[PDB]
Design a protein around this nucleic acid. Structure first.
Lengths: 104, 78, 94, 91, 90, 104, 94, 78
DNA sequence: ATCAGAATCCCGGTGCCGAGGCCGCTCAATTGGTCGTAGACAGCTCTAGCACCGCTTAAACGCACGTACGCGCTGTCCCCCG
DNA sequence: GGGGGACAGCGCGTACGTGCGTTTAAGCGGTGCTAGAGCTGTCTACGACCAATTGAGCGGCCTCGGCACCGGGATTCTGAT
């Protein structure tokens, strides 16, 4: 027996994603490739954010990712910021940004 | 209870927003717009609670209320 | 004696480089309870519900203060005034 | 009462991209919220596409189109590559 | 095609017996009904799944109309819906 | 044959609304009262807009409602303007509004 | 000769009363086609598709000019400038 | 083709927006803003067309694109 | 004021062309019986929210005080309005 | 082409940043209680479905009288005087 995640070479759960599509009732039927495609996309997005968040953790000399690192990774990337525009990351804080007219 | 949102707290929020100089009339104005925002979120959160026949507002009720007002919050089960 | 503006800019750098909640928790909790009383009586609250409200309100106000600041700078001022808050909210659709 | 989450899969992907980096419970909660949110956005758009074309089945084509409509710029380009590769390997 | 044109006209005669409507205005009304129908049904759906229910009741519709519609429009819409259900059950 | 619409005393179609709920991928099952409630609420909203639009038509010396009259009815009342905030009426135009500082 | 501003206010009063499209149809159609060419070649367009695009675009520009105007007034000016358009869009999130 | 959006047309749009005085640099700025808006809507409308395997962009494709960008249009079939 | 003269209201005409009145009919909504299963509801339980209490201590407060930024006033020059 | 709005310079002076030790109460940890969320069982009463139908809804067709826009006359705009 080979799990559908292992058959697609993915770490994300294809079987669970399939069930969650079927029991959203989002449609009457769900194709066999739809959960595989969706799982791969979710995995890709998580990898991107985690990669960028781990870099932010290393640049603050930390070995564990915290919400601050996730906020730094998302707001410092034009595409991730645009995707997560109407999102609030709890305990994420803000980018350091001061308007030039206010400076010394 | 709205006075519990003190001037120093409103200055701290403004400082995180990058504001250097604040007029004295801003504190009362901020208390107003905070009250409106809270009322709108709490109203919807309580509606979800009543629909669930619960007597306790849950974090999920708040998350749903924020989501439907276009202020999605991550970190409370999202 | 630091000149007016020096300590203000130091506070901006302190609060922008940090993530903690800036409103005292107990007073905020009282406000949340007082507001909810008008919608239904004898309401209980999970502590995480109040904290989720806190986080959203602070994020909303910080975001509004950012837009209010831009309005003030637009009027050639470095001081935020109620008219700046009003303009920001009007343009945002609030 | 068991509450399912994507924590184990977040951890797996983290260990691949940064083997020596861990994650806090708060940060894990953010990641779980993120996956659930994106999952809803894509599935909801795919659902609309199917009804808009009078179809009763959500297939990989609907997911791909939803990914083009929601993900901005190069995030869409790479996400489509990942999804296509996975479907090919699975078949 | 299916449209709500006939029903919009029936209600127009009830509110304004001597008033007609242009085809463009009818198209706006059709778009309006479809839009609000979808908002309410979508909220009722999320509200069912959030409470782990499989069934869309009048209760889900009432709550959706209690979240979507603003101020006194919710108050009157709820009255209309409740009256209709009561009349239908008898 | 007593139509569910006639049983509920409504002009809006309960049977059609029921079918649209059942085929619209909203839930697995739909209660008997749900279409009745939805049809009523929906008809109430149409009556309210049409009544206000007919008044605007009579004020403008017309016997036919046009998109302008609908825009006038919606935009000049708070709750209808809030409900249809993120909406554009084709050929509806705008409300006559000039800032006081621009006046001679 | 009418003083500067008199005919401008007369035009405001005329266009705020009318609902007709203010962009010429054929130039707008040409713009729509040329922009679509970069996404897909040999694209046909329903007449109503172009009209839907025109209605939405005009409603977008009119709404933006309203918000731009209100920003100019905030700077005590009666003239709209690019900085006003930029502020409005920034606050709107665009 | 962007020059087809003439200064008089932009002035008319500003007049409906209640604008009394216009700077000379506004015309080029407006053209740029309109181009971005159109590109964004047309991109999504064409995506819907390609998904339907059609060679003709329909009014429905435009309506759907506007709806998903939060600019719902009434009068064109939804 | 003071009158000249366009801009705009307002009145009678007109025909014409979309809205509505009207016919034919068909298919989707209706009526009624049978199944099943979801959820409406009774009891348990033990979880979490709540009220209450001690102490503390860090934070809010009033005002005295300096000062510099907000805005009133004047003058220009040339950009848009017509 | 012209003229009136945008821009510059400035007085100025009053609105508010900073301190400081004062007046306030946040908050953190402990102590009990119990409203009530949620689980378990049931019974079952309402919905899905299957089969005949029929009567509104919709495609088509006409006539009409509401209204776009033509010519005239008026009044109140506004600018020269």
């Amino acid at each position: 027996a080979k799990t559908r995640s292992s058959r697609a070479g993915l770490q994300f759960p294809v079987g669970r994603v399939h069930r969650l599509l079927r029991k959203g009732n989002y449609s009457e039927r769900v194709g066999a490739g739809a959960p595989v495609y969706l799982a791969a996309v979710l995995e890709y997005l998580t990898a991107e954010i985690l990669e960028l968040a781990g870099n932010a953790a290393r640049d603050n000399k930390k070995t564990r990712i915290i919400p601050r690192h996730l906020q730094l990774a998302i707001r410092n990337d034009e595409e991730l910021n645009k995707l997560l525009g109407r999102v609030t990351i709890a305990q994420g804080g803000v980018l350091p940004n001061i308007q030039a007219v206010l400076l010394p | 209870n709205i006075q519990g949102i003190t001037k120093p707290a409103i200055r701290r929020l403004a400082r995180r927003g990058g504001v250097k100089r604040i007029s004295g009339l801003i504190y009362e104005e901020t208390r107003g717009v905070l009250k409106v925002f809270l009322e709108n979120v709490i109203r919807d959160a309580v509606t979800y609670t009543e629909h669930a026949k619960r007597k306790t507002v849950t974090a999920m009720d708040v998350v749903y209320a924020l989501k439907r007002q276009g202020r999605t919050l991550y970190g409370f089960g999202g | 004696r630091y000149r007016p503006g020096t300590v203000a800019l130091r506070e901006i750098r302190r609060y922008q480089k940090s993530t903690e909640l800036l409103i005292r928790k107990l007073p905020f909790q009282r406000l949340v309870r007082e507001i909810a009383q008008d919608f239904k009586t004898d309401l209980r609250f999970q502590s995480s519900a109040v904290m989720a409200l806190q986080e959203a309100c602070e994020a909303y106000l910080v975001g509004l203060f950012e837009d209010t600041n831009l309005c003030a700078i637009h009027a050639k001022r470095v001081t935020i005034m109620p008219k700046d808050i009003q303009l920001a909210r009007r343009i945002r659709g609030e | 009462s068991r509450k399912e989450s994507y924590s184990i899969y977040v951890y797996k992907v983290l260990k691949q991209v940064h083997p020596d980096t861990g994650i806090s419970s708060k940060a894990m909660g953010i990641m779980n919220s993120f996956v659930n949110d994106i999952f809803e956005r894509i599935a909801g758009e795919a659902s609309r596409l199917a009804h808009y074309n009078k179809r009763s089945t959500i297939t990989s084509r609907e997911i791909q189109t939803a990914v083009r409509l929601l993900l901005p710029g190069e995030l869409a380009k790479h996400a489509v590559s990942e999804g296509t590769k996975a479907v090919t390997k699975y078949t």
